[PDB]
Amino acid sequence: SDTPLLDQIHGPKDLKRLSREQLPALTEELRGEIVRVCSRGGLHLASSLGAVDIITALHYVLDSPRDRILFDVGHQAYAHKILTGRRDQMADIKKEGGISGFTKVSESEHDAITVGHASTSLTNALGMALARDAQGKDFHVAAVIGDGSLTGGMALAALNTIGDMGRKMLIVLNDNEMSISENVGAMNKFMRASVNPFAAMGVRYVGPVDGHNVQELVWLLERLVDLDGPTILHIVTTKGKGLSYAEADPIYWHGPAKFDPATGEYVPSSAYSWSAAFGEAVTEWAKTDPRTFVVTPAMREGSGLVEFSRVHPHRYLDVGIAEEVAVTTAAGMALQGMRPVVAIYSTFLQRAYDQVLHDVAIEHLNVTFCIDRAGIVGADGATHNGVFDLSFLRSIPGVRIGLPKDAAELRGMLKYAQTHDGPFAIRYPRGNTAQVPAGTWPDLKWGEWERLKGGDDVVILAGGKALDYALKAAEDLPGVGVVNARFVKPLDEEMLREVGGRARALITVEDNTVVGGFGGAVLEALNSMNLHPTVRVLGIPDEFQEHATAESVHARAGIDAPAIRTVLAELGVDVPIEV
Amino acid sequence: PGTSDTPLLDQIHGPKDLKRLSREQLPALTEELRGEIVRVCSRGGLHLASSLGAVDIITALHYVLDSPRDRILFDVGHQAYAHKILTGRRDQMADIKKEGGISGFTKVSESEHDAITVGHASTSLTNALGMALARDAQGKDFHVAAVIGDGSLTGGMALAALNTIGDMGRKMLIVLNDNEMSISENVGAMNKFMSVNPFAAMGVRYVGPVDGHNVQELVWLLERLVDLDGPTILHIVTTKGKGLSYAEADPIYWHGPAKFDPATGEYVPSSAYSWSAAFGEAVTEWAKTDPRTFVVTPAMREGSGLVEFSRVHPHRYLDVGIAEEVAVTTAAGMALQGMRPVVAIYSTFLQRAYDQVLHDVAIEHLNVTFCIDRAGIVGADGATHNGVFDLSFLRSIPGVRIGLPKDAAELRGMLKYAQTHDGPFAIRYPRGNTAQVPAGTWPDLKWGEWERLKGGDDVVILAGGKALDYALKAAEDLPGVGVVNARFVKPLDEEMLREVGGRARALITVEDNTVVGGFGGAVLEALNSMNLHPTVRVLGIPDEFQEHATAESVHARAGIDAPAIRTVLAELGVDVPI
Ligand SMILES: Cc1ncc(C[n+]2csc(CCOP(=O)(O)OP(=O)(O)O)c2C)c(N)n1
Ligand SMILES: Cc1ncc(C[n+]2csc(CCOP(=O)(O)OP(=O)(O)O)c2C)c(N)n1
Ligand SMILES: [Mg+2]
Ligand SMILES: [Mg+2]
């Protein structure tokens, strides 16, 4: 029946009924299935394909859930779900109401940690190891960490604590030489005679061994697992193993775009997108500005920096999954007269809060942040919704914050930010925007925002994604004015004083948490101006958001067009119900 | 006239004057500097032992290189007193950390000789890489040298940095200042370990370990190392407190020693009962009847008041080094396993773990409790240490609760709740003291309920923790003015806030936090969504880093102290005696 072995496994107990010599076949069955799961659309094919054999060996040897198997990032864990009672739900992975794309504690007893951000497996594994010992229990603790994740400060510091404590712990290093856009770093410790790249951490080191030989992998685990103290099993795997398209092109196949398993041919997006626009703009800027230096923390592809990396190799830098290192390395360059631009997703910028505050903001350094995936990002769910931005940057003295309405306005903010003292942050969503001509570089007074639709009475203030919704909401409402509130640090105070002084009510809309964001900046402003209009604050509630499309999350959170219209109606505006 | 005992320093106004000395005279400068720092520090709360410890390499560094052209970077900066004495600031060591004076750590706008502004650890390597890359980009050849101590190296931000530094392969000298002390004894793996190179796996040259107090022999090395291609780790071994017998004998206390006389080594015993202690006492007592409690600290056992606890409960204490990120996510891991970990951390260093708190602890609403010391303005340490953002950045995290205990009984109350209810909880408290309290004090409180502390609607002041002291004083002989212990920032006391904003002429909020996105901001959001529009005055620390002064000073000029609230009260039309 194409999957004879898998058909009889509903969990790891069913798995432990197969002989070792049956496991390679199960291994093929699992690859078949993972390919079918993903041929759907945007999911993690290659990382999971590469990890099948180790996940099989682990679940064969250890008995979860008494034993705890911890996954770093969790994107490489599809076989794990398939072997733990979730085979049917893979159909809806990352879909609203379905299971999560990563391991989630809520979801299953077998999911040890809720992960999505990288490099948290080892600190968590240590936490469990310590808790175990205090309790007087004993049960295995295995962490699966990829070579890319090993690059993070968090992984590297953790080992050093792990080695000090010297507890019973299995750490499997899943080594691909691939991150997304292929690993960097004086390879973290692998890539070194041949002995122990970790000796200085006082951790036992085994391998490298062949990470696709499931039988050899069982044998090893069985012997490694009752050893005293911490161990690194270093396994070498091929990203996208068992699909020649994925194998040959490990970067595209990390997140393929709907394909036919039989051919290797995929649906090509010809979309534009903020990422590409930022791409074009910096690639163009650095052509005339020798001081511009782009740094990404492991996200060349995700941020539209491929052409940038090819057109200015001498002004590009990939610091690995090390956001802390991105930000303060930019801080260094800025101190030496450069104009560094840190390209970073909103959730990942969270990892560098202190680096922004202490290393950049104190001395008002010249670092421009271009922040991608700002607001809800959708399918990745709680771990990735870049929904805190406008709160946490806002609190930091001297850090400027703007939201471009479009590519032209992005460019302007970029030009400006690159051309004036201090840090500037510019946030934009996952989503598309229109291409503008080469050499489009408008001047804008930073902090000034613009009227877009006439109307006092009720005035909507929003920027970026929220501004679409605002402009859609007001389409046929003559009373209702809209303002492109495109700066959040500086608010446009002259404008807000004037609008808040002579309007019945105001609405603020933000693709950000409601708490301490744009809504709050306005309230604080109005309060210092001793002004008291009716204000309705729409954004994401103070609570995390499961995976869902950005459009439902917004619909349910009350910031999409229909919702703004409902709020407008509560306010007294005549809103049609429409044919 | 020249009646000094420091003939060499008397003639050195910067690195250019120092290179006039022969290399044989260096040991003599080495010793003048030593005496100079002991005299400077006998004042009070300064960084004696670390600075003495690094006297010899700082001398050798300025002798070999030449700032400003070459770039000498210092990690943390608490060890760089010699650097300040050798760079035209010898005379203002008298006022270091004082308002209006030079800063305790390296500071960029303070001297062209200060390559980075520092206060938080582990940031040196990464700025050094940045400077190196820019220099290279610009087509220049000046030296970049960083000084990092061994505790500092414990930090993920240095460890990752080495990883990127080894990858780029650029001219750079990194001196490892290894005295196997942090503030406490340094914590290990890497400390345990130290004809093989410990950094082999990161493509960085390794020289040493070498004697770090031989100034003669450190110049020799530097002269040969500094023109090599690629990055170099120079490993030196020093003695924290070198030069001062009793500092050597006890490098934990002499790290930041009280007023002392150099001749004996006798110091003023600071017999205050601080918050740190009130914490320590409370956790020690609590862990005794609760085996699920586990206290984690990121290198701050002594500062967080955990010395006794680490001795009484060795099996429920953990010191993860200068790595806040690990402190928090180790705690997540613990709580995931039915334990009840307590992360003891200064507000300012909690910033290093914002993402860990959010993603590793908040997403699954985990049983981690944060006792946050140094909440608010810490004073003399200035901008890099004032913990004035925490009410803002925690508030934004779904499910993270925040209390400010009026006092030590209330600390115990909050600690009791957090430890016996689900989800995360953060308790923040100042530098300073409260009255001791009897053993077994464990009040029951309802999390999120404020207490009224003074009668009178009309103007109501809302303050918690340290602001509360000011609020209460301000209000003294003013019968219209009521004070609420707003002992909870998240959640707020919804009902009592609606009651008070519904009835009072005006409200004042006060907070030892930035004014942006904090308690005030939270109050304003609540009133908004309750559709209540009273006059509110929001008092706090302005959206502006605060240079070194005394808390009293910073609070004076920010307008959160008593006379300042009294002024606000007059402005709202309260009758306030002149
Ligand atoms: C803190 C953080 N920054 C960036 C990312 C983006 N990211 C998601 S998966 C991935 C690659 C992880 O590399 P590796 O551990 O080698 O995974 P593998 O391709 O080997 O399966 C990255 C960089 C992330 N998940 N977390
Ligand atoms: C993020 C952070 N956490 C904690 C501190 C507190 N701290 C200041 S100095 C120091 C010890 C520094 O150790 P090391 O580099 O070995 O310097 P040494 O005392 O040996 O001179 C610590 C932990 C800090 N500066 N930054
Ligand atoms: Mg990999
Ligand atoms: Mg040291």
mmCIF file of all heavy atoms in Angstrom, chain B residues 88-107:
data_model
loop_
_atom_site.group_PDB
_atom_site.id
_atom_site.type_symbol
_atom_site.label_atom_id
_atom_site.label_comp_id
_atom_site.label_asym_id
_atom_site.label_seq_id
_atom_site.Cartn_x
_atom_site.Cartn_y
_atom_site.Cartn_z
ATOM 1 N N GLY B 88 45.137 61.793 29.760
ATOM 2 C CA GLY B 88 44.784 63.178 30.022
ATOM 3 C C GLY B 88 43.652 63.373 30.995
ATOM 4 O O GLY B 88 43.069 64.450 31.045
ATOM 5 N N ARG B 89 43.345 62.340 31.774
ATOM 6 C CA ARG B 89 42.261 62.413 32.759
ATOM 7 C C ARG B 89 42.683 62.058 34.204
ATOM 8 O O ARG B 89 41.826 61.928 35.097
ATOM 9 C CB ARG B 89 41.054 61.592 32.293
ATOM 10 C CG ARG B 89 40.487 62.049 30.940
ATOM 11 C CD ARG B 89 39.511 61.084 30.265
ATOM 12 N NE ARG B 89 40.182 59.923 29.680
ATOM 13 C CZ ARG B 89 39.558 58.907 29.100
ATOM 14 N NH1 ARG B 89 38.237 58.896 29.017
ATOM 15 N NH2 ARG B 89 40.256 57.894 28.604
ATOM 16 N N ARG B 90 43.999 61.933 34.423
ATOM 17 C CA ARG B 90 44.590 61.640 35.744
ATOM 18 C C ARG B 90 44.005 62.513 36.855
ATOM 19 O O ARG B 90 43.768 62.034 37.960
ATOM 20 C CB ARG B 90 46.117 61.809 35.691
ATOM 21 C CG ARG B 90 46.902 61.815 37.032
ATOM 22 C CD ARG B 90 48.080 62.817 36.994
ATOM 23 N NE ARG B 90 49.295 62.521 37.774
ATOM 24 C CZ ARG B 90 49.340 61.893 38.941
ATOM 25 N NH1 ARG B 90 48.225 61.467 39.510
ATOM 26 N NH2 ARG B 90 50.507 61.700 39.547
ATOM 27 N N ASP B 91 43.766 63.786 36.549
ATOM 28 C CA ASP B 91 43.278 64.751 37.545
ATOM 29 C C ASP B 91 41.817 64.616 37.905
ATOM 30 O O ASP B 91 41.427 65.020 38.999
ATOM 31 C CB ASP B 91 43.529 66.180 37.086
ATOM 32 C CG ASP B 91 44.970 66.584 37.228
ATOM 33 O OD1 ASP B 91 45.710 65.974 38.043
ATOM 34 O OD2 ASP B 91 45.452 67.513 36.558
ATOM 35 N N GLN B 92 41.013 64.072 36.989
ATOM 36 C CA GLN B 92 39.584 63.938 37.230
ATOM 37 C C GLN B 92 39.184 62.567 37.698
ATOM 38 O O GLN B 92 37.991 62.241 37.698
ATOM 39 C CB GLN B 92 38.743 64.313 36.011
ATOM 40 C CG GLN B 92 39.390 64.053 34.699
ATOM 41 C CD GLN B 92 40.122 65.262 34.211
ATOM 42 O OE1 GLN B 92 39.556 66.350 34.178
ATOM 43 N NE2 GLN B 92 41.384 65.091 33.844
ATOM 44 N N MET B 93 40.165 61.753 38.083
ATOM 45 C CA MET B 93 39.843 60.507 38.761
ATOM 46 C C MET B 93 39.238 60.845 40.109
ATOM 47 O O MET B 93 38.470 60.074 40.659
ATOM 48 C CB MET B 93 41.058 59.594 38.913
ATOM 49 C CG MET B 93 41.686 59.206 37.594
ATOM 50 S SD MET B 93 40.525 58.440 36.453
ATOM 51 C CE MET B 93 40.558 56.740 37.017
ATOM 52 N N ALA B 94 39.552 62.025 40.627
ATOM 53 C CA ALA B 94 38.979 62.453 41.894
ATOM 54 C C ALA B 94 37.454 62.454 41.816
ATOM 55 O O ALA B 94 36.796 62.113 42.789
ATOM 56 C CB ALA B 94 39.513 63.814 42.300
ATOM 57 N N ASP B 95 36.899 62.787 40.651
ATOM 58 C CA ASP B 95 35.438 62.895 40.500
ATOM 59 C C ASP B 95 34.736 61.837 39.640
ATOM 60 O O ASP B 95 33.544 61.954 39.361
ATOM 61 C CB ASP B 95 35.079 64.295 40.021
ATOM 62 C CG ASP B 95 35.453 65.346 41.028
ATOM 63 O OD1 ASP B 95 35.303 65.078 42.239
ATOM 64 O OD2 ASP B 95 35.916 66.457 40.716
ATOM 65 N N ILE B 96 35.463 60.805 39.235
ATOM 66 C CA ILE B 96 34.876 59.752 38.436
ATOM 67 C C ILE B 96 33.582 59.234 39.083
ATOM 68 O O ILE B 96 33.504 59.060 40.302
ATOM 69 C CB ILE B 96 35.907 58.618 38.161
ATOM 70 C CG1 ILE B 96 35.340 57.601 37.157
ATOM 71 C CG2 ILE B 96 36.394 57.963 39.472
ATOM 72 C CD1 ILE B 96 36.372 56.699 36.527
ATOM 73 N N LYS B 97 32.566 59.027 38.244
ATOM 74 C CA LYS B 97 31.208 58.612 38.636
ATOM 75 C C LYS B 97 30.413 59.715 39.301
ATOM 76 O O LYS B 97 29.214 59.578 39.452
ATOM 77 C CB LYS B 97 31.192 57.335 39.492
ATOM 78 C CG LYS B 97 31.377 56.057 38.700
ATOM 79 C CD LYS B 97 31.909 54.921 39.566
ATOM 80 C CE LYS B 97 30.872 53.842 39.828
ATOM 81 N NZ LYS B 97 30.866 52.866 38.722
ATOM 82 N N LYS B 98 31.061 60.802 39.698
ATOM 83 C CA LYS B 98 30.314 61.927 40.267
ATOM 84 C C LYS B 98 29.566 62.709 39.185
ATOM 85 O O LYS B 98 30.014 62.783 38.033
ATOM 86 C CB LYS B 98 31.216 62.859 41.067
ATOM 87 C CG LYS B 98 31.594 62.337 42.434
ATOM 88 C CD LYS B 98 32.510 63.322 43.133
ATOM 89 C CE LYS B 98 33.398 62.627 44.140
ATOM 90 N NZ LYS B 98 34.611 63.444 44.433
ATOM 91 N N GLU B 99 28.419 63.277 39.549
ATOM 92 C CA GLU B 99 27.693 64.122 38.614
ATOM 93 C C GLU B 99 28.651 65.190 38.117
ATOM 94 O O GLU B 99 29.495 65.662 38.870
ATOM 95 C CB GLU B 99 26.488 64.769 39.276
ATOM 96 C CG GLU B 99 25.655 65.570 38.304
ATOM 97 C CD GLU B 99 24.372 66.086 38.914
ATOM 98 O OE1 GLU B 99 24.008 65.640 40.032
ATOM 99 O OE2 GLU B 99 23.724 66.937 38.264
ATOM 100 N N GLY B 100 28.555 65.547 36.844
ATOM 101 C CA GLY B 100 29.428 66.577 36.288
ATOM 102 C C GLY B 100 30.850 66.136 35.981
ATOM 103 O O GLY B 100 31.586 66.877 35.333
ATOM 104 N N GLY B 101 31.230 64.938 36.431
ATOM 105 C CA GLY B 101 32.588 64.432 36.254
ATOM 106 C C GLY B 101 32.709 63.403 35.155
ATOM 107 O O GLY B 101 31.729 63.109 34.457
ATOM 108 N N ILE B 102 33.912 62.857 34.986
ATOM 109 C CA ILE B 102 34.109 61.751 34.037
ATOM 110 C C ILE B 102 33.392 60.487 34.502
ATOM 111 O O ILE B 102 33.170 60.294 35.695
ATOM 112 C CB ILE B 102 35.614 61.457 33.757
ATOM 113 C CG1 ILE B 102 36.388 61.184 35.055
ATOM 114 C CG2 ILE B 102 36.234 62.601 32.966
ATOM 115 C CD1 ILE B 102 37.721 60.488 34.858
ATOM 116 N N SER B 103 33.040 59.647 33.530
ATOM 117 C CA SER B 103 32.301 58.408 33.733
ATOM 118 C C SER B 103 33.165 57.239 34.248
ATOM 119 O O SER B 103 34.359 57.151 33.954
ATOM 120 C CB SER B 103 31.602 58.048 32.423
ATOM 121 O OG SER B 103 31.521 56.656 32.221
ATOM 122 N N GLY B 104 32.542 56.348 35.017
ATOM 123 C CA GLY B 104 33.223 55.177 35.563
ATOM 124 C C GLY B 104 33.763 54.210 34.526
ATOM 125 O O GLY B 104 34.786 53.569 34.733
ATOM 126 N N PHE B 105 33.063 54.095 33.405
ATOM 127 C CA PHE B 105 33.521 53.240 32.313
ATOM 128 C C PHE B 105 33.944 54.119 31.133
ATOM 129 O O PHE B 105 33.685 55.323 31.107
ATOM 130 C CB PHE B 105 32.432 52.228 31.893
ATOM 131 C CG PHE B 105 31.603 51.696 33.045
ATOM 132 C CD1 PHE B 105 30.527 52.427 33.548
ATOM 133 C CD2 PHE B 105 31.902 50.462 33.627
ATOM 134 C CE1 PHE B 105 29.764 51.938 34.618
ATOM 135 C CE2 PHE B 105 31.140 49.953 34.697
ATOM 136 C CZ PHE B 105 30.069 50.689 35.187
ATOM 137 N N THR B 106 34.645 53.494 30.200
ATOM 138 C CA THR B 106 35.010 54.039 28.906
ATOM 139 C C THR B 106 33.793 54.671 28.212
ATOM 140 O O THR B 106 32.708 54.095 28.230
ATOM 141 C CB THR B 106 35.604 52.862 28.117
ATOM 142 O OG1 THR B 106 37.024 52.925 28.217
ATOM 143 C CG2 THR B 106 35.380 52.976 26.677
ATOM 144 N N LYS B 107 33.963 55.863 27.643
ATOM 145 C CA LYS B 107 32.845 56.607 27.050
ATOM 146 C C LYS B 107 33.329 57.462 25.879
ATOM 147 O O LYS B 107 34.263 58.266 26.033
ATOM 148 C CB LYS B 107 32.151 57.492 28.096
ATOM 149 C CG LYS B 107 30.908 58.195 27.581
ATOM 150 C CD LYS B 107 30.044 58.780 28.708
ATOM 151 C CE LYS B 107 28.712 59.383 28.177
ATOM 152 N NZ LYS B 107 27.945 58.520 27.196
#
